[PDB]
Structure 1
């Protein structure tokens, strides 16, 4: 319909990737980009699984992998136990129903895997365009092992 969606999505993806590469710490990607509302609802906690849950699991794995990497052939592989880790979360406010679904999924994943709620840091940004700039500060904070970005974009 409009190139607004294309520009927003490409820009946020490029910003998140550049931020992750420059700051050298994992930033997970939970921006559900959908053409219609049906598939967005499907991926927002419905039959196709919670993308927030998947992103939280990926963040846990990446944090453990980086811990093991900094601390025959040697194989580097991170566990899924999230005990003793601190995660940062950035969530868009647009489409707040699906956003809250994803946030609940991610928090549930972290808590069930072992992360205490005292370690989760949540930041709400008005739109998905503002995710990279806030994620920059959340990642530059040294007490954040991994950052997660969460948002919804629908054509």
Structure 2
């Protein structure tokens, strides 16, 4: 449970730096399933909801980036395209996180036609699968959603 968590963290960071595209680390790491529930305990501040919010800000920031000069990202998600990769194990909480992230995009102006969802068997395969979506020229940001119970 330690190898997988370390590897996915390293892979996501390396992909983001190499490909120059925002990747959000929406991965739940909990030792107990109860704590994993509390990370998405019926609150609107779900892990997927917060990750989607950060992804929208990062994408808008890179659109402009690519007194003094101040750069920051808006939350206007309209006209943007996002990719989402979700793990399969323990899908009871995974589905909740996916719904929250999709809700955040739609509520802030995103369209479901520009949202691509990919499902993977295990969290170990998240980085390799997300690499394809990140390398796609028609993707502005990538959100990785998973759960790791120890």
TM-score bucket (shorter structure): over 0.9
Give the drift of 1:87.
0.2
* Gaps in structure 2 of 5+ consecutive residues: none
Q: Could you state the TM-score of these two structures normalised by the residue count of structure 2?
A: 0.97
Shift in Å at residue 55 of structure 1? 0.4
1:47 Cα shift? 4.4
Cα distance between partner residues in 1 of 2:94 and 2:126 = 13
Gaps of 5+ in 1: none
CA-to-aligned-CA distance 1:50-93 (integer Å, 9 cap, x gap): 000000000000000000101x1100011001010000000000
Structure 1 runs, 4 residues or longer, greater than 4 Å off: none
Could you tell me the TM-score, scaled by structure 1's length?
Answer: 0.94
Shift of 1:48: 8.4
- Aligned-partner Cα distance in 2 for 1:75–1:123: 35
C-alpha RMSD over aligned residues: 1.0
> For residue 63 of structure 2, what is the aligned residue in structure 1?
67
Instruction: Compare 42-51 and 125-134 and name the one that shifted more.
Output: 42-51
> Which residue pairs with 2:34 in the alignment?
38
After superposition, the Cα gap between the structure-2 partners of 1:45 and 1:108, relative to the gap in structure 1 and judged at 3 Å, is farther
- Number of positions where the alignment pairs a residue of Structure 1 with one of Structure 2: 150
